[PDB]
Amino acid sequence: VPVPTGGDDPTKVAMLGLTFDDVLLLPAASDVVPATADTSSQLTKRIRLRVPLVSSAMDTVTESRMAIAMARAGGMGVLHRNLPVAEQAGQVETVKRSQFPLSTKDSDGRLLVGAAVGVGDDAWTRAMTLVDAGVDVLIVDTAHAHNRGVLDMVSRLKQAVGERVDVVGGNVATRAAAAALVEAGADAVKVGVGPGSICTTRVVAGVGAPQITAILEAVAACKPYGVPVIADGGLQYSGDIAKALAAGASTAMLGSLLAGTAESPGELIFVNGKQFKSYRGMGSLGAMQLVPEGIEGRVPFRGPLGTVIHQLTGGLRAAMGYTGSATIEQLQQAQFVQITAAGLKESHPHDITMTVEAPNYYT
Amino acid sequence: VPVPTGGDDPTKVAMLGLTFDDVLLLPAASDVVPATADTSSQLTKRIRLRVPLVSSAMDTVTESRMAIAMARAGGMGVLHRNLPVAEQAGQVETVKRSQFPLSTKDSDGRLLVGAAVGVGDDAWTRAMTLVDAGVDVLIVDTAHAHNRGVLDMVSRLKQAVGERVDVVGGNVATRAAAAALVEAGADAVKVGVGPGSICTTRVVAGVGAPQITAILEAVAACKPYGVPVIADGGLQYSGDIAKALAAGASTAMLGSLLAGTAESPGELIFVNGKQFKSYRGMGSLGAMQLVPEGIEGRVPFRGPLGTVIHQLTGGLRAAMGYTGSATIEQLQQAQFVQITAAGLKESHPHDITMTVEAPNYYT
Amino acid sequence: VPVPTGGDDPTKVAMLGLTFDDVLLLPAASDVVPATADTSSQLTKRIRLRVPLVSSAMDTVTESRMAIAMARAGGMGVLHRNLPVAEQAGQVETVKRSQFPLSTKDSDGRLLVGAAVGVGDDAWTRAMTLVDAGVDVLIVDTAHAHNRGVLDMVSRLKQAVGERVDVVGGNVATRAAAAALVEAGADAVKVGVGPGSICTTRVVAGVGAPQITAILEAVAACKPYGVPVIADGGLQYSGDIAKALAAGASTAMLGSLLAGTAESPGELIFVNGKQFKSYRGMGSLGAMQLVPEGIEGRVPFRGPLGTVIHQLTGGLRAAMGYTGSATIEQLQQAQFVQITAAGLKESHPHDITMTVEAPNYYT
Amino acid sequence: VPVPTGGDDPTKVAMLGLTFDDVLLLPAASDVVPATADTSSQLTKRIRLRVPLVSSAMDTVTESRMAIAMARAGGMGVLHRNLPVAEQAGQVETVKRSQFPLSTKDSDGRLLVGAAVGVGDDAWTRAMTLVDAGVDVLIVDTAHAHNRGVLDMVSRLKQAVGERVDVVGGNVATRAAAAALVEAGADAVKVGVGPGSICTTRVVAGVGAPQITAILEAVAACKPYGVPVIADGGLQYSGDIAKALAAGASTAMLGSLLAGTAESPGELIFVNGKQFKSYRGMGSLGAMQLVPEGIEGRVPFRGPLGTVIHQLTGGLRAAMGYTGSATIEQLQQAQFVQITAAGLKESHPHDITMTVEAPNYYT
Amino acid sequence: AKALAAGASTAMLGSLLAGTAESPGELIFVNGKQFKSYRGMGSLGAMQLV
């Protein structure tokens, strides 16, 4: 009579959530060489990137230098909103005023750049100043996009400057929230609540949703209207990028994987003869200066951004070759297999003493 | 033909139990700002607390100082019964005889306090002495409330001093035990058998049930009759408190989270330059002086109790904002998602060298 | 179309096996005091023990001293068969020739004792010599009792000396093997293939079954005919003994839990100031002097056997009080709840630095 | 309404994949002595090995010495293709031109040997040169055999040199891929995509399938046509070999298990007084000289090959005795039990300080 | 400097040069760090004893 997990309501525990480590991509019939695969994808309904990667809007990840490097690499960067409005507009102008076949450019031939804003009248003034500076895409960047205020802000921005710039809606984790964002007029939906490597929301508040299931649910609401999905947070390997794209996301937003590059803001730190640099959540105590939802830490230095992007894109191309996907649209139709805890350790290198770190696999 | 787990009886392995680490709260459409969320909840059918947290009845957790501080913070404290009867009555008198808007006070304006009693005639004398000293709530505090003697004691206490004080029934882990306590006349039901951080009941005896499933099962029996549920044991984060309340519990009883504060009894101990203090189970060999069901240990010093309570309440408010719950009664209607082991390590911070501890998240 | 785990045969992966760590005992309505519980149980169809515990027939576990101590404590010991026939008969006579209210005795007032034999004509000579020496129960002690030769040996022993002594069949792991042993005429069935703490069978050969499922399957075949079941191996806590009895077994056989006592054969060893003593499988290379199926190691010294037995019986009595079982026969009807990996770490003590080892819970 | 793992497509997450650590073999009625079990099995449709073990085609595993030793031990070796064509043909000639009752030989009495080729016209020239030298079997050795080019190469090789040599098809993980290889004319199918100990494909690309499920799926397509299956990668114990053969595979290909033997190519390395030797994947950066799909490492020294082969065969014989299988074909009809994470640690030695390593179990 | 100040005219170097790229022998990886072999000429391996 009772539900097998307790109680009498079968909907109290709605579903079993899967994350990146729970699934593997199944190989399929292939006619695709990894070098010949096309990795272009839609960032928004009007913007297409050669490489479907976007830099996170964090004060230890993206400033003008990172945005320029990401745009030249074939992606795009999103400037963080921790600095004043005038400084953010200056960074936008620095990017717009700025070897690279894949570089993403607008109609005037200048590099594309995105900028993050919050909610409120101060956020409205920031958004208007950024728009007048020549921004290409505004990110309503919150922790909970299903709030009434976030939806109202997206609606207002679409009404005011929808012709000039694209508007992306903040993080959701359910089908209903994505549907609400689509109804509000968002040109793209960002997915993920709590999976970030520096996030403590799922511990502090106990609220979250595993990223693969969240992407599936959000795509189920966004695809019929042609609204692209950006998987944000929790990606540690190029295989995770491939899994995120196969689940239905159109682009991926990278955090820790880029915080260690030379183009990220911040100096270099030496610890026991090894190089690191600072990486902190935007809900951390230091960043928000309270109940923090992030931590402070450091990540190992990786070097130039181009090399990291090349490794990630090579992994994605290998995945596309394995699944037989000529385009990202075809990759979005691939199938998964669910694995157990033993399958995960089988997947990684095992019963071996690794003698040297590979370029795409770190200890 | 047979049961997939073995045998021919399908009810031999009745159900699959979930605990806090197995679930996450799902975000929902929200109009709630965390600072405006109302955290008040029923402790019993007659007592409403501003902060839904109660201190455990342990000789290393709650005495007069801890009870006074908890009452001032908006919760309540339960005085342990390891000391003689006269001293317990004296501690009740000290608390009653004793800046703090949230402070919980009875009709006379004195701070609320609770006291734990056992089962037997000596426990009856203790209960009468505590009632004569002005206690507001008695906890029949046993490891197994489904025993006939515990139900008899609850019925006797309700018959004798029902009009004067509230009677809370000891720990259960099933629907049937909760129903039996409700029929016996309990004003509140305490849930949890073996989840405590210092318990060895589930190892020494092999008896228990996971906390989320136990709360769901007990709520299924208590909610139709209006009897509140207290989730006792196994809580290490504010997110766990939010999960427990969302599972149908009305209040949470805290152990180790408060044992390291300055208001808990005991002297401060230095180990390798760090500060700790003692924390032991009431079924430990030291506390019960045999077949013990608890251990002795120590927990790090955490400072004043008010800051800890504020961090816990901030996490709870964040959860209420995420789920769109203006009240605790609305939070009790939120939905869960079940996660795997990989989802558990995705929820916590990962692939990062934390450089300093967060106020609400400890290494 | 295909089976969810692969292939087209739904019987290829027959069932999901549970071990001790996968389940917990559900509390039930109780009128039982742990001190008043009755722990007597059948070892065979003719022999009843006051304490349902038996010592393993291993050369680092049971000889004359251990057998005498176990018999005085209320259980029984099984003499190992590594020594020559004459020495085993001498040990049997030493036990029979040998403060202890629970002592298990025959009709003549002498202590009960069991002896292990193998398969073959040499085993027949050993068995006849042991029967002539006054042994009470013979254990056909093999790794695979479903072999034709083991069943033939059991039938021969029952035909020849069935009236004088009881015959116990070696280790099975499935319902069919237990049914075959019952058909052969065994007075008791020993259950467990690979769960021993010193066994490598499930790694070397990949063959075994989780112990709880194996016990349930064996009981489903043995209980209708009134044939007792002995859970052998894998027991590390008293709660595991309670689980094994609740799953339907009538007795439990202990290995490592008794190897560290003073009555076990072997001297005392010092490593880094701590005391240990040797413990090896009978299929280990050292013992069988090849393809070994066991390892050699050492276990910490625990002191006299009586204290260990008292702790185990106290744990069992606590579990009986929790389940409301007046007798072992009633404990055999208790219900389980299945728990996940998170529930298992909730069940043990957590988030605490233990200051001293408990008498029934070790670091 | 939705799929419990997310979305609306029930085939998005096709199945649950099992690996070796997820299953155990069930004991069955037996009349088999391990010393009398027959381990002969089909490698291809025309080649029968006395020991169903083949050495991996890796530059740290198999050269002339290893191939000769494997042929003498009753199996076969596959010469790697990292060296130039002339050198590989010279190795083949060395092996052919070369006490041992189980040695596998052709009609002329010379030792059997196999060689690996890639895809393309250069691989075509290599294959013709190897066939001219007298190789017994060609392995189309790729990471993705469901590619169109691999199938075309298999078809061409069968059309050209079909009557002289047998052609084995590269690694698959799905029923459809095995069916395509069968249609193309393969004489045996090699199964496994990413389970190898030195593979990072499941991390770099996120693509693979757990090995037991993959073997079951491939056997479902290969058994009706009498095409043998070779399980390749992820084997660490002899029990894994038994499980793989029971899943339906006819032979097993071994990597790391043989990389530490005297006959493998490479010198011996000393680290902290212990002996190791190099072991690297063929997709490693060092071996392929780029986006690598393997790592470099080293494995402990194990001694002569014959002892290792004997221990593995002894474990297999023990498994065949447990399951009552006189032949490998009977072992292919055995049954599994699925186990959890707790069952996995029950299977291994536990709660013991292993003092000396066993010949078949290493710490 | 100390050796020269004590009166010696030149210094002969061993381990200080054994780790350079111009020294004979291949490179070895251990725990992510690079090393290379260095043995005395009276070592058992070199002289192939006491």
Ligand SMILES: NC(=O)c1ccc[n+]([C@@H]2O[C@H](COP(=O)([O-])OP(=O)(O)OC[C@H]3O[C@@H](n4cnc5c(N)ncnc54)[C@H](O)[C@@H]3O)[C@@H](O)[C@H]2O)c1
């Ligand atoms: N078993 C594995 O999972 C695995 C993975 C990587 C490498 N390897 C080993 O590395 C060696 C070289 O393998 P290789 O195949 O990379 O060599 P390769 O570069 O010679 O590839 C041979 C053919 O395999 C196919 N192929 C390989 N990877 C593909 C992909 N991602 N997408 C589409 N087609 C693909 C292509 O048709 C290619 O022409 C072999 O010894 C192989 O066993 C094995």
Ligand SMILES: NC(=O)c1ccc[n+]([C@@H]2O[C@H](COP(=O)([O-])OP(=O)(O)OC[C@H]3O[C@@H](n4cnc5c(N)ncnc54)[C@H](O)[C@@H]3O)[C@@H](O)[C@H]2O)c1
């Ligand atoms: N993705 C995540 O899970 C996550 C979590 C924490 C912080 N962050 C990052 O930190 C920065 C600040 O985030 P922020 O949203 O707290 O900034 P903020 O304080 O500017 O909040 C913006 C709006 O988000 C909504 N909101 C946020 N948390 C809410 C909650 N718990 N309940 C109800 N409404 C809530 C409110 O409408 C609020 O006005 C951003 O850059 C964001 O990406 C992200």
Ligand SMILES: NC(=O)c1ccc[n+]([C@@H]2O[C@H](COP(=O)([O-])OP(=O)(O)OC[C@H]3O[C@@H](n4cnc5c(N)ncnc54)[C@H](O)[C@@H]3O)[C@@H](O)[C@H]2O)c1
């Ligand atoms: N919540 C838990 O899981 C847990 C477990 C062990 C101990 N404790 C704490 O230890 C203290 C003492 O508890 P206690 O109950 O052991 O004290 P106690 O010895 O005073 O027992 C009180 C009554 O509880 C019942 N009872 C307790 N354990 C039982 C069992 N195993 N079987 C049957 N009836 C049983 C009996 O009726 C007994 O008279 C309390 O403060 C309690 O909270 C709690």
Ligand SMILES: NC(=O)c1ccc[n+]([C@@H]2O[C@H](COP(=O)([O-])OP(=O)(O)OC[C@H]3O[C@@H](n4cnc5c(N)ncnc54)[C@H](O)[C@@H]3O)[C@@H](O)[C@H]2O)c1
């Ligand atoms: N319970 C276990 O899982 C386990 C495992 C290994 C060893 N042991 C212990 O080791 C000792 C010797 O055990 P043993 O059985 O190896 O002794 P043994 O060599 O005397 O075998 C006795 C009989 O068991 C049967 N048998 C055992 N292993 C078999 C196999 N792999 N295939 C087919 N039949 C098999 C045969 O009929 C054999 O004649 C005993 O004390 C036993 O309890 C126990």
Ligand SMILES: *c1nc2c(ncn2[C@@H]2O[C@H](COP(=O)(O)O)[C@@H](O)[C@H]2O)c(=O)[nH]1
């Ligand atoms: C939680 N999440 C946070 C916080 N600041 C940013 N974020 C989110 O995490 C993403 C990065 O995750 P990685 O796994 O490191 O890639 C960001 O893009 C953002 O969405 C925070 O304080 N808490």
Ligand SMILES: *c1nc2c(ncn2[C@@H]2O[C@H](COP(=O)(O)O)[C@@H](O)[C@H]2O)c(=O)[nH]1
């Ligand atoms: C088991 N449980 C015990 C014992 N004494 C008290 N308790 C229970 O644990 C709760 C505390 O749990 P924490 O996880 O520490 O917060 C107490 O409130 C009580 O219910 C004991 O000896 N064994």
Ligand SMILES: *c1nc2c(ncn2[C@@H]2O[C@H](COP(=O)(O)O)[C@@H](O)[C@H]2O)c(=O)[nH]1
């Ligand atoms: C596997 N099992 C073995 C071996 N010798 C004995 N045994 C079995 O183990 C039991 C003891 O296990 P504990 O977990 O220590 O209680 C014995 O009673 C016997 O059945 C061996 O070599 N391999």
Ligand SMILES: *c1nc2c(ncn2[C@@H]2O[C@H](COP(=O)(O)O)[C@@H](O)[C@H]2O)c(=O)[nH]1
């Ligand atoms: C992944 N797999 C690779 C690579 N080179 C070879 N292999 C495969 O691994 C098998 C050996 O696995 P073990 O677990 O070590 O036995 C080989 O037979 C081959 O199929 C590589 O770079 N990545």
Ligand SMILES: *c1nc2c(ncn2[C@@H]2O[C@H](COP(=O)(O)O)[C@@H](O)[C@H]2O)c(=O)[nH]1
């Ligand atoms: C002792 N001395 C040895 C050996 N082989 C060479 N040598 C001497 O050591 C010098 C190098 O010393 P470093 O401190 O390493 O610079 C050489 O120049 C030679 O004189 C030997 O086996 N034992």
Ligand SMILES: [K+]
């Ligand atoms: K791997």
Ligand SMILES: [K+]
């Ligand atoms: K996280």
Ligand SMILES: [K+]
């Ligand atoms: K516990």
Ligand SMILES: [K+]
């Ligand atoms: K074992």
